[PDB]
Design a protein around this ligand. Structure first.
Ligand SMILES: [Cl-]
Ligand SMILES: [Cl-]
Lengths: 240, 240
């Protein structure tokens, strides 16, 4: 390959454990999320796949995962860059709710529409409310950020980071590690495998298993959909 | 102040605990080193002194300290930049030795000369030996790096990072956190307080206590020698 691109989704958060919709709410990893981060570091070491640069979101669940993985692989010194553009989808007024409370507030029809739609965002979160990031200083330069997102939105706001920051790193032949979230990783994978809008909502991204893309001279993948560093553990997540 | 500059030396490593000369040998923190990192994070939070950018060395004992501190202060999202120029002094052929073995190999006179001299480096470490960094990939761009340093050397190789990378950040009014090592922090402090060669070898830098410099329009300090965020705990280290 001219270039290698490694994709890691973080493991379980406290709000995954409680079945709460997180979005941009900056929650921590559980112990089991941490153990997945250590494990993914072991997998990077076993395959001698040590990145020249790390990219993360601004959310502690990604950042901590990346740190734990690199610490386990004894590779903490590499450059790191972070952006909001790698954040999970903003879940709008669903941030901090669960299935039952969302269904009661908006009805079953809308809850089903938002869960599977590519184009339809949930309703905006209230400005200044407990789980809104609008006053958060990390988002000042984007006016506090969006008040809700669908996957389409995530793609629109991720693409510029990919073409302007990450693509140049990949062209230089460097091995790039991105540690981020389901929907932002979906945005990237959509672009690398030229997936359609429908194919991408249905895309499964297992947690804690780095996914290796080997890219050619045009930065198209040598193997469509990439190669998980533990293919058997990954078939396990997808099958369940 | 036009600008605030925060200085943190990392806490105890495994080789501090065993009284071994470390230099650029990339050793880990002890539990007590970790607890100092958490504590320094609490001190940054209590003083509401949250940095806009973090600078570290390439050594895991600094990097981990910085991560633990920012994690405790809930401030993990900030940009980070690292350089070898913030590394501890390279201890030459003393890397991995202790007082007794150095004295027996080189004599008491040289051991005393190297410990207190500004200008006299210890002897070079053997290339390819177990505690040499010359083959280490993080130092490829500098030819494997120096085979030994005195404090004078540290100043020569730190100054360019200060004037070219850190000074521009300080001019923009940003709060800068540097997490590094005794001798690299000594190089910086020498420059900020225009200390003489003699004054600086004798400079004490306590571990685990951030040191706040408030800089004026010329980037000269408002308070010479800075203000420790826990002045009483700091008088404790200096007095012992
Ligand atoms: Cl965490
Ligand atoms: Cl460590």
């Amino acid at each position: 390959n001219t270039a290698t691109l490694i994709l890691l989704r973080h493991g379980e958060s406290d709000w995954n454990a409680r079945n709460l919709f997180t979005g941009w709410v900056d929650v921590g990893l559980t112990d089991k999320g941490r153990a997945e981060a250590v494990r993914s570091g072991e997998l990077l070491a076993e395959h001698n796949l040590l990145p020249d640069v790390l990219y993360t979101s601004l959310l502690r669940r990604a950042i901590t995962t990346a740190h734990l993985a690199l610490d386990t692989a004894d590779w903490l010194w590499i450059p790191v860059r972070r952006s909001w553009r790698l954040n999970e989808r903003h879940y709008g007024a669903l941030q901090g709710l669960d299935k039952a409370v969302t269904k009661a507030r908006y009805g079953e029809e809308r809850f089903m529409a938002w869960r599977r739609s590519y184009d339809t965002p949930p309703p905006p979160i209230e400005k200044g409310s407990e789980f809104s990031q609008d006053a958060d200083p990390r988002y000042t330069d984007i006016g506090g950020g969006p008040l809700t997102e669908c996957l389409a939105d995530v793609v629109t706001r991720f693409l510029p980071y990919f073409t302007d920051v990450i693509v140049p790193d990949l062209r230089t032949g460097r091995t790039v590690l991105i540690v981020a979230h389901g929907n932002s990783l979906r945005a990237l994978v959509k672009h690398l495998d030229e997936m359609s809008d429908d194919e991408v909502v249905g895309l499964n991204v297992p947690t804690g298993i780095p996914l290796r893309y080997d890219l050619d001279a045009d930065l198209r993948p040598v193997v469509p959909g990439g190669t998980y560093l533990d293919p058997e553990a990954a078939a396990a997540v997808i099958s369940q």
